[PDB]
Each structure stands twice: as C-alpha cells, then as structure tokens.
Amino acid sequence: LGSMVFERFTERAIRAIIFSQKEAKSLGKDMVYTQHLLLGLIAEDRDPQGFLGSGITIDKAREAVWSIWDEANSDSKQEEAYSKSTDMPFSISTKRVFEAAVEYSRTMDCQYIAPEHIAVGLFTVDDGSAGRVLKRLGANMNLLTAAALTRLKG
C-alpha cells in the first residue's frame, strides 16, 4: 500500500486489521482495543486447525469478549476519547501493538508485516486484554506466540 502507514503490511494483515474494526463495531464500540484486534486475527486466519493451530474459533472468541467486557463492569483502562466502519480509530494499546509488529519484523529482517508479527506484538506488548480472553478460552498465550514465530519460518 504505497507510502501508506500500512505499506509493508501484507494483504492478510490488512484484512485482520479491517476485521478488527468490524468486530469492535459489532460489540457496540467506537475504537479498536487489543481484544478486538485479537478477534480480527482470529477471524482472518484460515488455518483448518483454528487460530495459530490452537483450535480457537471466532464464535467462541466473540462470546468470551462480550462476556468479559460487557456482562458486568466495564474496563477502566478503555476510555480513550467515523462515517464508515473502516474509519474506526485504534486505541493507544492497539497502536503500540502495530508498532511492535513492525519492529519485530524488522529485527527478523522480514520485508513484510504479517498477521503473525501482529500476533507476536499482541501477545507481548498489550494492556493485558488479549490475555484475559485467552485465559477465558483456556489457551496458553506463550504457546500461541511460539506458533506464530514458527509460521514465520516457513
């Protein structure tokens, strides 16, 4: 995407990002926080074995998210202050993740930022939101990070 901020992001990565916006909107949100990004990544991944081969699926992930943030008290950490769904802004935590993804990709001497780089970012530099969802799903976040790194090897 030439001389865009997302120029080096792959087609898959961009799709996951757009999906994060859609997922957030479905939940009645006006900004994409990191749990939403997690949803976008899950929605995007076409692995037949589920997200990062984990058996996680989007419907289950969506239930978890709704439950955690919407069925009881709201999250004090997510009150940061759009005419179509792809104009929905990203939270400071989410932006941090994207920056981490870029950094990791550069460190690895990769030409692109893939969803896997975003996942590594998500699972290393976020506000704890992704972890809460994974915990609810019974998943091990560090194993998922490893799986993402494994994918990037080919």
Author numbering: 75 to 155, 160 to 232
Recite the paper's sentences.
In this context, the plant caseinolytic protease (Clp) complex plays an important role in degradation of accumulated and misfolded proteins in chloroplasts wherein the chaperones aid in ATP-dependent unfolding of protein substrates to be degraded by the associated protease machinery. The structured, mature forms of AtClpC1/C2/D consist of three distinct domains such as a short N-terminal domain (NTD) and two ATPase domains, a feature very similar to bacterial ClpC proteins. The N-terminal domain of ClpC1 is known to perform the regulatory function of substrate recognition, either directly or indirectly through the adaptor proteins ClpS1/ClpF for which it becomes a binding platform161718, whereas no adaptor proteins have so far been reported for ClpD. Here we report and analyse the crystal structures of AtClpC1 residues 94 to 238 and AtClpD residues 79 to 233 (hereafter mentioned as AtClpC1 NTD and AtClpD NTD respectively) that correspond to the ClpC NTD of eubacteria.
The 1.6 Å structure of AtClpD N-terminal domain (residues 79–233) revealed a α-helical structure, having 61% helical content. The domain is made up of seven helices: α1 (E85-L101), α2 (T106-E118), α3 (I132-D144), α4 (I170-M186), α5 (P191-V203), α6 (S207-L215) and α7 (M219-K231). The crystal structure included two molecules in an asymmetric unit. The crystal structure additionally shows the 26-residue long middle loop to take a different conformation compared to the 14-residue long loop of AtClpC1 NTD. Also, unlike in AtClpC1, the two halves of AtClpD NTD do not form the typical four-helix motif repeats. In AtClpD, residues 122–128, which makes the short stretch corresponding to α3 of AtClpC1 NTD forms a loop instead of helix. The fact that there are helix breaker residues such as a Pro and two Gly within this stretch supports the experimental evidence for the presence of loop instead of a helix. The presence of longer middle loop and the absence of a helix in the stretch corresponding to α3 of AtClpC1 NTD make AtClpD NTD very different from any known Clp chaperone NTD structures and perhaps might attribute its functional significance of having to recognize specific substrates during stress conditions, without the involvement of any adaptor proteins. When the structure of AtClpD NTD is aligned with AtClpC1 NTD, we realize that the long middle loop comes directly over the region which may otherwise contribute to ClpS1 interaction. Therefore, AtClpD not binding to AtClpS1 or AtClpF could at least partly be due to the presence of the long middle loop in AtClpD NTD which would sterically prevent any such interaction.
